[PDB]
Antibody, heavy 210, light 214 residues
Framework: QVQLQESGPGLVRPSQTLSLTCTVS????????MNWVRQPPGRGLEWIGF??????????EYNPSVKGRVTMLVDTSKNQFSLRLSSVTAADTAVYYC????????????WGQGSLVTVSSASTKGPSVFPLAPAALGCLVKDYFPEPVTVSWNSGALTSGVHTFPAVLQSSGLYSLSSVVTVPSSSLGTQTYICNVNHKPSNTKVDKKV | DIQMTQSPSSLSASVGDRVTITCKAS??????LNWYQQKPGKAPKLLIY???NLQTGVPSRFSGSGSGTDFTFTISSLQPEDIATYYC?????????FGQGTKVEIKRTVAAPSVFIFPPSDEQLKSGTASVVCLLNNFYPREAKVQWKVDNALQSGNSQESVTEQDSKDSTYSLSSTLTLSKADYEKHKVYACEVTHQGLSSPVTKSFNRGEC
């Protein structure tokens, strides 16, 4: 139907400023309040605030919490919905969501996906995928940072049988998960099984063949 | 702010059982209290809007009750596809607020574990580094202890748990168990097994290997 995909820097140096974009498609701000939502690691959502339609002028009303730092706004010509936080600290870490307050259904009927914004005085790191040979198959997406890393096999086809695990932070101080997907006993001829480890924070792409 | 607190926090009902979550409200709410279901890893979804209104798409075994301050969310009968964490929230005043959250793990019957010890990746072992992964798959409860063994020995401090969220087809956890003994030692040895005891499958079990090469 409708689409709300987020976007933005994945890791951010303290002191610097958080920046995200809700790219919308399937409706208009002219008949809908666009607000955001944040959720730190394993916690509960926290409403940052929203912005109002065309009638009300595109005015904004922040939650008493961040107010003073936040600054939403919208470019109806590029169908976005930018959010900017100044003074990001390890606290403002979560998955920043852009829900679209609707009609009665409100508040929040259409949420984006997710965009993890980690605050760390650290830096990036390209992940390494190691073809894990076998019945079961998997891939080792080893040593990278910041999170999250997303992997999907055969750019579709293979579902029901996949078990992409969480992540663990290695002493290296690096993350390392390993996606695995058991397949039928006989059905591994001279066949394919691409491995699509995606990872935005870095700007890295790898499609290992297990 | 108008503190909103759900209850219970992390419960454990069963399939066919009615799960009933309730969330009081510091102040008054009226009909302004929705509900969301947040499946594992995703984003919130709207399950009920304005005290007792149902969404389009959302099942019928879901439903809201009353309004005022005492609120309650109920599930006719629970299905393995309802292993989410449900949230309540209100929109009368502002800022908006949500409950601390209620997880809801599904209880089933023991599904004794499956292991698939995967020897190292020829090339990872070109880093002076090398990790031997261990995997069980689809079991229950979550209580599973993996015992790593080298040439019938060990040195520990290499293991490392990571298990998944309850499946919504089966309701079975699965956890990998990477042994990252790094290079120069994968060689210095030759049998690195991966024994594994669990609550439902008596007398321990393992998938191992005396390596099988150089």
């Amino acid at each position: 139907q409708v689409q709300l995909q987020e976007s933005g820097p994945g890791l951010v140096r303290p002191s610097q400023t958080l920046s995200l974009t809700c790219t919308v498609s399937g409706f208009t701000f002219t008949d809908f309040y666009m607000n955001w939502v944040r959720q730190p690691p394993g916690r509960g959502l926290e409403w940052i605030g929203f912005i109002r339609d065309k009638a009300k002028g595109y005015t904004t009303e922040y939650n008493p919490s961040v107010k003073g730092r936040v600054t939403m706004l919208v470019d109806t010509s590029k169908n976005q919905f930018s959010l900017r936080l100044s003074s990001v600290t390890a606290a403002d870490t979560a998955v920043y969501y852009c829900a679209r307050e609707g009609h009665t259904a409100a508040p929040f009927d259409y949420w984006g996906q997710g965009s993890l914004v980690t605050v760390s005085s650290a830096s990036t790191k390209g992940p390494s995928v190691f073809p894990l040979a076998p019945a079961a198959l998997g891939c080792l997406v080893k040593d990278y940072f910041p999170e999250p890393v997303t992997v999907s096999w055969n750019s579709g086809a293979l579902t029901s049988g996949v078990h992409t695990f969480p992540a663990v932070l290695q002493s290296s101080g690096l993350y390392s998960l390993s996606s695995v997907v058991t397949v039928p006993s006989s059905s591994l001829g001279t066949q394919t099984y691409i491995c699509n480890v995606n990872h935005k924070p870095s700007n890295t792409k790898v499609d290992k063949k297990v | 702010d108008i503190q909103m607190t759900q209850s219970p926090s992390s419960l454990s009902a069963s399939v066919g059982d009615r799960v009933t979550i309730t969330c009081k409200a510091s102040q008054n709410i009226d009909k302004y209290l929705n509900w969301y279901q947040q499946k594992p890893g995703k984003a919130p979804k709207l399950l009920i809007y304005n005290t007792n209104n149902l969404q389009t798409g959302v099942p019928s075994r879901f439903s809201g009750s009353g309004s005022g301050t005492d609120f309650t969310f109920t599930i006719s009968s629970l299905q393995p596809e309802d292993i989410a964490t449900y949230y309540c929230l209100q929109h009368i005043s502002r800022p908006r607020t949500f409950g601390q959250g209620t997880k809801v793990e599904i209880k089933r019957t023991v599904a004794a574990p499956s292991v698939f010890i995967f020897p190292p990746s020829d090339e990872q072992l070109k880093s002076g580094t090398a990790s031997v992964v261990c995997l069980l798959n689809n079991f229950y409860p979550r209580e599973a202890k993996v015992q790593w063994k080298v040439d019938n020995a060990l040195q520990s401090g290499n293991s490392q748990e990571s298990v998944t969220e309850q499946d919504s087809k089966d309701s079975t956890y699965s956890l990998s168990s990477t042994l990252t003994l790094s290079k120069a030692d994968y060689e210095k040895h030759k049998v690195y097994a991966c024994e594994v005891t669990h609550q439902g499958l008596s007398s321990p079990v393992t998938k191992s290997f005396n390596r099988g090469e150089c």
